[PDB]
Specification:
- Keywords: Allergen, Disulfide bond, Pheromone-binding, Secreted, Signal, Transport.
- Binds pheromones that are released from drying urine of males. These pheromones affect the sexual behavior of females.
- Its main location: secreted.
- This is Major urinary protein 6.
- The structure is a monomer.
- By secondary structure, this protein is mainly beta.
- The protein has a single domain, classed as Lipocalin (Beta Barrel), CATH 2.40.128.
- About 10% of the residues lie in helices and about 45% in strands.
- A ten-stranded antiparallel beta sheet has the order 1-3-4-5-6-7-8-9-2-10, with helices on one face.
- β4 (about 50-60) and β5 form a beta hairpin.
- The chain is globular, with a radius of gyration of 14 Å.
- It binds 6-hydroxy-6-methyl-heptan-3-one (LTL).
- 6-hydroxy-6-methyl-heptan-3-one (LTL) binds near residues 37, 53, 115 and 117.
Length: about 160
């Protein structure tokens, strides 16, 4: 297990397929049925100073491809991407082969909100990992009512 902000982090290892398992935010509407941030990650392609992120959005079961590139910032293990405002994110924890936890801060017109996600190499993860994710969300001030499990709706 490693953190993108640590020194033993090997970016190249998060390359490949991933799935959105759980999404959480202190701004629930952002990840609800019609939210701009209810994104289902499909793949991460690691570049020297960037990350190519491929997702799909869903509207009444219809899926649409979406891609974007996040660039490294001045801070180690942190990336930024423009999407409905300015976003910076880090990877507080991942084991490379099974799960990945992300933490993002969005700033738009003086307004801010944070989003945290749990991603898996498989379309679902154990309840222990999910609970461990819920505990990290708590530490960031995000309550369970604002945590949404999408493991049963992440496929097209
Ligand atoms: C605009 C980019 C996102 O919402 C999701 C970022 C990750 C996959 C890092 O959590």
């Amino acid at each position: 297990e490693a953190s993108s902000t640590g020194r033993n982090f090997n970016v190249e290892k998060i390359n490949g397929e991933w799935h959105t398992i759980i999404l959480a935010s202190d701004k629930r509407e952002k990840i609800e049925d019609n939210g701009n941030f209810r994104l289902f990650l499909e793949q991460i392609h690691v570049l020297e100073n960037s990350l190519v992120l491929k997702f799909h959005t869903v509207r009444d079961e219809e899926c649409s491809e979406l891609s974007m590139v996040a660039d490294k910032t001045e801070k180690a293990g942190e990336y930024s991407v423009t999407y409905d405002g300015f976003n910076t994110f880090t990877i507080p924890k991942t084991d490379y082969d099974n799960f990945l936890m992300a933490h993002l801060i969005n700033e738009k017109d003086g307004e801010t909100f944070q989003l945290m996600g749990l991603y898996g190499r498989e379309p679902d993860l154990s309840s222990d990992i999910k609970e461990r994710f819920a505990q990290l969300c708590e530490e960031h001030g995000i309550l369970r009512e604002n945590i949404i499990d999408l493991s049963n709706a992440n496929r097209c």
